[PDB]
């Protein structure tokens, strides 16, 4: 696993950086950034020079980009840009030139090779400036030249994508500093060749690797006609069938998240995996904390689990027999929390309320005021109807009466901004397969650390789902208690990375745009929403089923499915409904195509239309 | 998801079918079979003709193969072989010719394309006799010829791998029947073109797809010299770094199981996924039942869970307050079952015994005879030391005294033949990341159905891990209570398929061969095994650490990891040990390489003979 990458973009061409020449509508260096992020890169250091503003503006779209300018770019070569970048590199890394177009498989190849220092090379490209590599019995670099008559053998041609350790970069930089006066325009290939004399730098030769440098006009124009369609074909060969899921459970994911599950087998006890788990714990909690909130006041505890499993974790680990829990039940998640508390014989009372209209906050405060209750359990967003409870009022108020707050945010977390501190939330549960847009398998609880340890002496009500034992064992040892869903957690790492890329606020805006399109269509058709828009989460909408016998949920479902849309049925006993969610990787235009299909069906069964009769004496 | 495939192998070229020409050491049809299985194919129908005995022998190595002979293969074309096969095809399927070598990505492409009828085509191959396809603006098939003069356009060249619906095959066979007399040597390409006039058959053109048919003498060696290395390069571009894990946890898996996680997003409530889960239950229970025992007497209940989760499911769902549970504890799994029973306040007693020596079966029988206990909970294989408890004696004996049997087989199931009926096991737990060689995430309990049903009215001790609620909800509705680990379960399906390919008996023999290599090396090194060989499972071995201060677990571990081997520490406080497992996709040659590395380290610290002056 490579976490960091360096893009060299100091040198000159146009009135443009060559990385910003556009193919298929997007600048080529931006496509390089996208492929790198797709393979799990966390930090991309771009060494800029001529026309730096372009890269500085591109960095505003990708938080992973750090632009570092080589101010002496006109008097130096690529190694100067590299040394300028090198202070920002902490680990093994990928080194790329900005003018490349390449099959992303190369990345996958370089990352999946054991050899720590590894140059990517191709077969005969019969291009213009070829960089030829000379290799030994162990396919390690022995020579490098742009003239074939200078090398004892020719193993391949330099692509411009190389995997290097921080130590190799240190040697390259030391050799560069020693020669700043004699060789001020040294290329990085030279420094790597010299470093290869004391450090084995292997070459991985992909004979038919598809790639091209876009520096000139010849390669620029031959790439659009021959090389780039080849790259697009190769990359789409790995594309997965896109199903647009309109259910609030596992939704549509990006293919990069899908492939994050594909990784080397690892023993979960190893320090690398414990590091992955610590990283996940640290990163997941920040999606539920404002920047102003100290992340150290909170912890994350993960389980191989569904979201309801994390709810059971909270309910069965946070309420001692000494206390009494008040459970708010205005939906199926709250009812499930009540049932869990009941099964465990937890001292509890239930506050039942409507599934599609807001809670009576004054009756809620009246019940808070009795001071009977030590703990409050409630739900932020009930997917049964899409009602959004005002926990920013409910939970601080419960805090005012001395209660500990336990919250289901399984279908709210990462879909909307949250700050547990100002929200007055001590324990918050969520899962990996909802608005974080990962794969199902990991449930987790973000805890106020003080409230979490006050749990330390509670008698255990269970084993696998006990919050404090799970947290403490990984605090003592760098390991989890039992085997975690390793591949699910790799996928979750990439989902977290892409959440940091998209931002929670802009993810909310995307969900809301899809919701707006759907609601506009619902209004245009005369269909009725159960929850008024003021109180709706923009994540799922419950729609009243038409009373006509011509309507069938199965018919609408199969019709939508024939066009790659998966709609969700209703769950209420009181009211016949169907549900449309818009989370996951759904795009607004996909919601409009579905909306066109929905209008087609509803008109076809007589909704929004006059019923014309054609009989006549 | 494509479950079926047809390979046409009727005509001749030598004294063997062309599919059995060998490149890279393996017959090309065997490579095709392996690539198909790797992509999740469950049934391969091979239409045979000349020298069918070769394919009949190949079917002995691959349970997925059904060989059906075109008895009139000398008087028919490829469509006759197809008609012979067509009665054995029930769903959408892949149609492949036997003399093909191809980039396996094509399979992945055809399976992941939404279009139901789909011809795979390549760019200009510049070979002999090429089949050119003429397509409309949709890229749908309108023409087919080996003369470019006859086609209004040239969209690509037919590869010989096609995805088809059962209805399209019905149309081709109907058109074939009426023309058995005039056109007895009809090719399948012709019947497909005829069906394509009334059914849209799309063409997917991978312009640079690497493939060749091995038909003449020219192409065979043009392929060994140029095409086949290209295919190998392309496929290794997708290869995952192979780490050989010697821990009993998640071990080394096949890349096919890894990539089975990559699938179209699906809502778990959809009927296709409920069918996948029903299939998983039905197939998973068979790995713990002999052929003679009725699978209807048993059920499988799955949870998003580790193995300890399944243990907790069993103990917290199978023992009522009215009864009394005896837990055998000769290892960490038994201690964990005891701890769970205690946390849930189960009326329970502990039978403690040595972690590395066999249970005293007579003292145990004496405790059974007390008639104090309604339930017995025990472990088949303790990875703490590799001790294998004689459950074939213990559990039938417990049944003889009227007890309900609860068994941890987390590290035994699918590593050795098991039959719950003759073993007297009522509830058996296991996981997805051990001997089945899948990915972690799914725990499951195989239950005697009658004993499972007497659980129906026990008060629930929990919710997520309650056995009967989980089972009943999926019995009633075709759905699970909560969101299951969908992708882990696709990986588990592929793992089940590969277990059916290998068979549990031969997997046991593979594990035991690795264990034999390791034990021979241990003996040659003078190291001591804590458990006697007759009570060892053969899946993991606990080895006493050398007394020399030159030894460090840290050093041995880093040295092994430096060569892609992951060794496991010991678990006892009483005796300092390290552990070597040999499960997962481990191959004997990899075990032999590890033994050489182990010898190197151990010699470097002095476990060789000492003779000097
Ligand atoms: Mg350049
Ligand atoms: Mg053929
Ligand atoms: Ni009328």
Coordinates of C-alpha atoms in Angstrom, one line a residue, chain B residues 298-301 317-318 426-427 445-458 467-469 471-472:
Chain B
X298 CA -30.3 -29.8 8.8
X299 CA -30.3 -26.0 8.4
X300 CA -27.8 -23.2 8.1
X301 CA -28.2 -19.9 9.9
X317 CA -29.7 -19.2 21.9
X318 CA -29.6 -23.0 22.6
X426 CA -26.9 -30.8 17.1
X427 CA -25.4 -27.3 16.6
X445 CA -24.5 -22.3 12.6
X446 CA -25.5 -25.6 11.1
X447 CA -28.3 -27.0 13.2
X448 CA -30.3 -30.3 13.4
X449 CA -33.6 -28.9 12.3
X450 CA -35.6 -30.6 15.1
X451 CA -33.3 -29.4 17.8
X452 CA -33.4 -25.9 16.2
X453 CA -37.2 -25.9 16.3
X454 CA -37.4 -26.8 20.0
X455 CA -35.6 -23.5 20.5
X456 CA -38.6 -21.6 19.2
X457 CA -40.0 -20.6 22.6
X458 CA -36.8 -20.1 24.5
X467 CA -30.5 -18.0 16.4
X468 CA -34.2 -18.7 16.1
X469 CA -35.2 -15.2 15.1
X471 CA -33.6 -18.4 11.0
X472 CA -37.4 -17.8 11.3

